[PDB]
């Protein structure tokens, strides 16, 4: 580990955490809209969405149905997913900072010990 290496990840996981957090607030928004619009229609990085259909994969009246549903489920899915992604990014920003300060400290002591070692051998 290098303070410069650790500061890269930290720099970036700090961003990924804010992006991810922002994407959920959006995902919640659309999902609000959707649960309402969903109401009526039944009387007629998105989580494991596209795959769930993909695996098990191998009019209008119902087309608007599967659609009006597949969007509540999706905006639902993206929401929770991005909710845990920043939950993960946060455990990491807190984890990396500790590695950063252990190293930061360690680097300073290591140097001084080198100086002191050389001074003392004169």
């Amino acid at each position: 580990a290098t303070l410069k290496d650790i500061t890269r990840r930290l720099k970036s996981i700090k961003n990924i955490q804010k992006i991810t957090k922002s994407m959920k607030m959006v995902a919640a928004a659309k999902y609000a809209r959707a649960e309402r619009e969903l109401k009526p229609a039944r009387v007629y990085l998105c989580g494991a969405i596209h795959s769930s259909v993909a695996k098990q994969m191998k009019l209008a009246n119902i087309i608007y149905y599967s659609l009006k549903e597949s969007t509540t489920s999706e905006q639902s899915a993206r929401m929770t997913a991005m909710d845990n992604a920043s939950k993960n990014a946060s455990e990491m920003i807190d984890k990396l900072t500790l590695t950063f300060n252990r190293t930061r400290q360690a680097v300073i002591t290591k140097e001084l010990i080198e100086i002191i070692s050389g001074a003392a051998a004169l």
């Binding site: 607030m25 928004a29 400290q105």
Partner: protein
């Protein structure tokens, strides 16, 4: 107040001792007149730093992170003179500077060994207009134990914080999805929380020459009751601004009156 100063131009040894000098003075109003003195060391980090400078000058090998080998004793011989003896007590408000934002840095780490509470002033809170701008969730105390403050005190306090915490949660929702999937319940935690946040602000007699307002020194009893009732639901009808910058709950009531 008596002011003792160790200016930044002074040599290590002077900025090293001035906190002891201030200490000496305070010990008098306790050991000679048995009062309850207040000691303010601004700032506790420059004390430690002065210690290291002196140490280095005396040619002693620095320890971890470059501080003095005697970091813990230099601190202990001073901190320990601050207590409640049978004659009286000295209470110290210490301004802390945390290096590198590193709370495990030897300077700060050592220092917390002695602290019984933290008063976190917050710029965010200030922005709510709320003053004193103390953070109700970040500030802490060792004596917030029912076995020490008594269950009532302890429960109110823990009541105030949770509500303040819960509201914090909702804060995100409100702004995005709009303030209404909010339950007969979720709408009450907010209301009260917002009343509380305000009830926690207060007018200082020190700022009278300026706020054109009268300072309030609310009593502990009045404090616990105040918040007790808001939690209780006794003033849910009262409006937010009734609680902004007042003393005892009674004033929250009267302000409401003048606010029709």
């Amino acid at each position: 107040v008596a002011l003792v100063y160790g200016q930044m131009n002074e040599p290590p040894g002077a900025r090293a001792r001035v906190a002891l000098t201030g200490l000496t003075v305070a010990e008098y109003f306790r050991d000679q007149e048995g009062q309850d003195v207040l000691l303010f060391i601004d700032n506790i980090f420059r004390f430690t730093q002065a210690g290291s400078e002196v140490s280095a000058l005396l040619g002693r090998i620095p320890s971890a992170v470059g501080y003095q080998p005697t970091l813990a004793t230099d601190m202990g011989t001073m901190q320990e003179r601050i207590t409640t003896t049978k004659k009286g007590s000295i209470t110290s408000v210490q301004a802390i500077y945390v290096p590198a934002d590193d709370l495990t840095d030897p300077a700060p780490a050592t220092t917390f060994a002695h602290l019984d509470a933290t008063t976190v002033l917050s710029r965010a809170i200030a922005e709510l207009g709320i003053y004193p701008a103390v953070d109700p969730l970040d500030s802490t105390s060792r004596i917030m134990d029912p076995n020490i403050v008594g269950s009532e005190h302890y429960d109110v306090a823990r009541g105030v914080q949770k509500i303040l915490q819960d509201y914090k949660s909702l804060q995100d929702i409100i702004a995005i999805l709009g303030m209404d999937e909010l339950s007969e319940e979720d709408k009450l935690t907010v209301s009260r929380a917002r009343k509380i946040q305000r009830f926690l602000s207060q007018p200082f007699q020190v700022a009278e020459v300026f706020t054109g307002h009268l300072g309030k020194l609310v009593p502990l009893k009045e404090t616990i009751k105040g918040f007790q009732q808001i939690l209780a639901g006794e003033y849910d009808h009262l409006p937010e601004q009734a609680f902004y910058m007042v003393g005892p709950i009674e004033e929250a009531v009267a302000k409401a009156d003048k606010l029709a």
